[PDB]
Amino acid sequence: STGSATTTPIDSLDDAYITPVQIGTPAQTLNLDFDTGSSDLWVFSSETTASEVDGQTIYTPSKSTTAKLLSGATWSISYGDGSSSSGDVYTDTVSVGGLTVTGQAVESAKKVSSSFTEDSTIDGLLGLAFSTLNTVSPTQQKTFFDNAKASLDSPVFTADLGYHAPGTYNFGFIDTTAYTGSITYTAVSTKQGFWEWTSTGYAVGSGTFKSTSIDGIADTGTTLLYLPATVVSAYWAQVSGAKSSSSVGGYVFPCSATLPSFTFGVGSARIVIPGDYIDFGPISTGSSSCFGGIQSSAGIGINIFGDVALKAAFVVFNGATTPTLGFASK
């Protein structure tokens, strides 16, 4: 089997991408944030505290003839940005782009943090990291991809995120028309539960490539590119007037600037992020100070190849017995 679904930016900045997902019988379609940095499929629901729902579409398990309460199961998750959610668990039929999993754990939120309530466009998350990170207790549950894997034509999914435009998540096949050149594959460590890999270096604009190992995670659920402070400083030094602002929370730059590209290495291959992809717009409405799309990871503990980096590539998440990642230009 295969599946293919369009993923759409939630706003004009590409802050996140939503993909429609069918849950239950009859189907209830929710728009979920596919997140290769986590491993829970959780949704706003009829059980979510009413004051914490503000415009999201909810899953109502009582209206699904295939929903079953997973007795005794609870979940609770905290994300790298400080947001969180928790609740109980159903199993139900879940379909993405024509690919159907029966008995998928659907984690129903009883509580969500304010950032989720305040974003009416995201109805939940669909985790695509390794199932070892799943938070369901006392019996950990498998991700959608883990449940589908054995049925897929090939045990892979691909992320093709658009810049200011829709893109595609495919399951079970590699669309050879969706990229240019070849796909370069690189080793993955699953020891932390992430799609963790080592970039071979970087360049700023037309500058020389610096060969240096940068360990990080491929994370579709993170907006920006978070890299070591040395790398980030070298990038922003090429933008007149750019500076790190402690009050804003990162590097800002004059909105009148033209940003240089940023290149990262994948083996001997190179993925070029155009400068425009690094502009996240005014820090507040009407400001002439703009927020940068490349930021320091120093306060995270890991480097994160988020959407800024991934949307410059066609990315293969190869879930073979020994997982690997693939990157192609497009």
Do residue 157 and residue 101 come from a single domain? yes
Do residue 318 and residue 191 come from a single domain? yes
What resolution in angstrom units was achieved for this structure? Answer: 1.0
Residues serving a catalytic function are: 35, 199
| 272-305 exposure pattern, b = at least 16 Cβ within 10 A, e = fewer | ebebebbbbeebeeeeebbbbbbbbbeeeeebbb
| 154-186 exposure pattern, b = at least 16 Cβ within 10 A, e = fewer | ebbbbbbbbeeeebbbbbbbbeeeebeeebbbb
Which domain, by its residues, includes 91?
5-174
Burial class from Cβ neighbours inside 10 Å (0-12, 13-18, 19+) for residue 265 reads buried
CA dihedral 41, 46, 49, 50 (to 10 degrees): 130
Look up the CATH number of the domain holding residue 323: 2.40.70.10
Other residues' Cβ atoms within 10 Å of the Cβ of residue 153: 11
Do residue 204 and residue 166 come from a single domain? no
Do residue 198 and residue 73 come from a single domain? no
Do residue 157 and residue 17 come from a single domain? yes
Residues 154 and 173: beta-carbon distance below 8 Å: yes
Do residue 15 and residue 145 come from a single domain? yes
Boundary residue ending a domain (125, 155, 174): 174
Task: Report the alpha-carbon distance of residue 91 to residue 3 in Å, rounded.
Answer: 20
The CA-CA-CA angle for residues 97, 133, 162, to 5°, reads 40
- The values of phi and psi at residue 234, to 5°, are -60, -35
Residues 287 and 250: beta-carbon distance below 8 Å: no
